[PDB]
């Protein structure tokens, strides 16, 4: 969902109306559940 | 404003250079220089005081 | 479709920076004279 | 049969935010794919330990997505894509 | 002291320099001037 | 030697020159007889228009890219004879390391404000008797930890040592030299709420531990015994005041602690429940 | 506005284009400049023989400037000269060279 990552850390919620006078970007992150392996062949 | 370049052209149908002269230097930049008398190039360093 | 991950983020969020939760994986981690003579 | 004429309009294709979207997201993990791999080869050669923290920089998507639509250039490849929103009216 | 109003609850804070851009309550930080308390006049032409 | 044109008004001659200036004639007038003094004054917000001393100095480069319609052999030639000419300088390693502290300040998610202090930081540092050797990370990651300090972030070691590999009293003592350095070249309350963004609580619970670690320095006794268990002994107190469902286990995973720690500093807290309440 | 002299006004008329020799530029320059860096180390005042010593003409006003003196709104500026120890080519009389060669012997030079 979007959010805000501030300037101390806290990743909240976001409001366009704030994003609007806030000058930031709004925006949501994306996740990948990664997978490792290792052959040994 | 901008003089440009054709209305440049039309002071020459007329023909009065004086107003073309005033405009170009009093108007613009005006500036008084120095030069040698033998190599005519701007080389002089004057002290003028 | 895609799922979205619905919770308060940052508890999310915290993994992805620091977190001081180092490792918990197994992934890349690397005489004598004459008796000598 | 006469000449095709490219002036036909059905045989012109458009492209929304999508299709453009594609071909830019498809570049910045292009580009990530390999620096990953970077920190892969480069672990096992100057022998340390990995960490899939400094294996990913978020900046390859980060940076990307911000100047492109920063600009109205998209690579200097295309330009003029982005624009300011016309509020002189709500007709604008 | 210069009297604040917060954006959401607009609860009337009046801090003061250096006293950090934070609501107090709610977790807003769109602060406000609030208007002066003198006179103004117009006309009606 | 001088150098400085001190322009008087030779009608006055009361004073240093209290003048004005017509910014919007470009000129220069007497502030007293009302007379002018010098006309076509230049600008100063002009040829920004058009457009780092405290960090690369008088130091120029300029970048040689290929052209358009050109060889593409000719820029290989360049870099080469740029390749030669790296050793003219040795600030190659400075930008190097600057790319990655910009690798671990972008990393970590610091604002660029961040990225200013470090690099202000190893700059006055660079290269000097004191240093020798040090693992270059380390006096990174102290230059990062400067940056936390000057402004006004909270980070942790630990945090620094969940991303690098500093081996800690190796970290601390090149640390401590790098002060001195500083302090040859004349507050835990900031990392609370991180930790209530760790665990999504609101502003009221978050504000809560906040009169919590406030009131429980000046209570005093037990002493330090090192803030950040200090810090989540607040969160487990006013936690306690309330009835989120997060216990002990699940705190102790997150921060990484130590769940019979905190029972013990609840023992003094519950002794202490008194003098805590507000409202 | 600018400061009354006495030398000889007059217009100019013929107007000749010529080339530079070398060492009219040394009877002319008053610089041999080396340092490449720009003001002072001490981020101030100049590198006096770097790219902008007051041995050549000032600007910002309250500079004075040396051998010119005056100000911004009268000195006309000087020139140095920077000799190398290697002679090049002239990007505008790349082709005006090759046709002498051309023309010209290799040896003898005839
Ligand atoms: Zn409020
Ligand atoms: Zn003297
Ligand atoms: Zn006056
Ligand atoms: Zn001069
Ligand atoms: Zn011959």
Redesign the interface.
């Known amino acids: 969902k979007p959010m805000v990552?501030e300037?101390?850390?806290?990743?909240?919620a976001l409001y366009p109306q704030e994003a609007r006078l806030r000058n930031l970007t709004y925006s949501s992150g994306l996740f990948v559940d990664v997978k490792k392996r290792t052959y040994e062949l | 404003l901008r003089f440009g370049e054709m209305e440049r052209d039309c002071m020459i149908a007329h023909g009065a250079a004086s107003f073309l002269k005033e405009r170009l230097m009093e108007a613009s930049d005006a500036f008084r220089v120095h030069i040698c008398g033998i190599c005519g190039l701007m080389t002089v360093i004057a002290k003028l005081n | 479709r895609i799922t979205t991950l619905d919770?308060?983020?940052?508890?999310t969020?915290?993994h992805?920076?620091?977190?001081?939760?180092?490792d918990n994986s197994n992934f890349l981690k690397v005489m004598p004279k004459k008796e000598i003579l | 049969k006469d000449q095709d004429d490219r002036d036909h309009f059905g045989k012109k294709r458009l492209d929304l935010a999508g299709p453009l979207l594609a071909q830019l997201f498809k570049t910045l993990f292009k580009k990530l794919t390999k620096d990953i791999f970077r920190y892969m080869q480069r672990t096992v050669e100057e022998a340390?330990?990995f960490?899939m923290?400094?294996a990913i920089?978020?900046?390859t998507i980060?940076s990307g997505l911000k100047y492109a639509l920063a600009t109205g250039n998209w690579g200097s490849s295309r330009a003029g894509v982005s624009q300011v929103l016309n509020r002189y009216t709500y007709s604008s | 002291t210069l009297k604040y109003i917060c954006a959401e609850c607009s609860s009337k804070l009046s801090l003061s320099r250096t006293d950090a851009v934070r609501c107090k309550?709610?977790?807003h930080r769109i602060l406000l001037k609030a208007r002066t308390k003198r006179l103004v006049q117009f006309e009606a032409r | 030697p001088?150098?400085?044109?001190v322009l008087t008004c030779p009608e006055c001659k009361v004073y240093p020159p209290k003048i004005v200036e017509r910014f919007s004639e470009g000129d220069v007038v007497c502030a007293l007889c009302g007379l002018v003094l010098?006309?076509?004054?230049?600008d100063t917000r002009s040829e920004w228009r058009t457009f780092n001393?405290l960090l690369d100095?008088?130091?120029?480069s300029t970048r040689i890219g290929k052209g358009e319609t050109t060889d593409m052999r000719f820029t290989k030639e360049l870099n080469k004879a740029q390749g030669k000419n790296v050793m003219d300088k040795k600030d190659n390693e400075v930008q190097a390391a600057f790319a990655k502290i910009t690798?671990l300040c972008?990393?970590?998610?610091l604002?660029k404000?961040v990225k200013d202090c470090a690099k202000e930081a190893y700059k006055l540092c660079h290269d000097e008797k004191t240093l020798k050797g040090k693992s270059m990370e380390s006096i990174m990651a102290a230059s990062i930890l400067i940056g936390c300090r000057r402004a006004e972030?909270?980070?942790?070691f630990?945090?620094?040592?969940?991303?690098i590999?500093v081996k800690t009293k190796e970290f601390g003592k090149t640390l401590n030299i790098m002060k001195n350095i500083l302090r040859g070249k004349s507050q835990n309350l900031?990392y609370i709420?991180?930790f209530?963004?760790?665990?999504?609580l609101p502003?009221?619970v978050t504000t809560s531990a906040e009169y919590t670690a406030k009131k429980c320095k000046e209570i005093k006794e037990i002493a330090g015994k090192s803030p950040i268990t200090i810090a989540v002994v607040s969160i487990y107190l006013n936690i306690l005041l309330f009835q989120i469902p997060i216990t002990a286990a699940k705190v102790g995973?997150?921060?990484?602690v130590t769940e019979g720690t905190i029972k013990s500093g609840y023992k003094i807290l519950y002794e202490h429940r008194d003098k805590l309440v507000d409202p | 506005?600018q400061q009354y002299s006495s030398a000889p006004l007059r217009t100019v008329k013929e107007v000749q284009f010529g080339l530079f020799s070398p060492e009219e530029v040394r009877a002319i320059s008053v610089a041999k400049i080396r340092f490449?860096?720009?003001?002072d180390?001490t981020?101030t005042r100049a590198?006096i023989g770097?790219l902008n010593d007051?041995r050549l003409g000032?600007?910002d006003?309250?500079?004075?400037?040396?051998t010119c003196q005056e100000?911004?709104?009268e000195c006309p500026g000087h020139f140095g000269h920077i000799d190398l120890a290697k002679p090049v080519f002239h990007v505008g009389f790349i082709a005006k060279i090759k046709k002498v060669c051309e023309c010209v012997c290799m040896h003898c030079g005839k």
């Open positions: 990552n300037s101390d850390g806290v990743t909240h | 919770e308060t983020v940052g508890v969020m915290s992805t920076g620091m977190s001081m939760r180092s | 340390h330990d960490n923290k400094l920089n978020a900046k980060t | 309550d709610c977790g | 001088n150098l400085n044109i010098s006309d076509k004054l230049v001393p100095g008088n130091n120029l690798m972008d990393a970590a998610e604002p404000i972030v909270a980070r942790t630990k945090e620094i040592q969940s991303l590999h900031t709420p991180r209530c963004s760790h665990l999504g502003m009221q995973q997150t921060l990484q | 506005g490449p860096e720009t003001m180390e981020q590198k770097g007051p000032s600007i006003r309250n500079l004075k400037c040396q100000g911004m709104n």
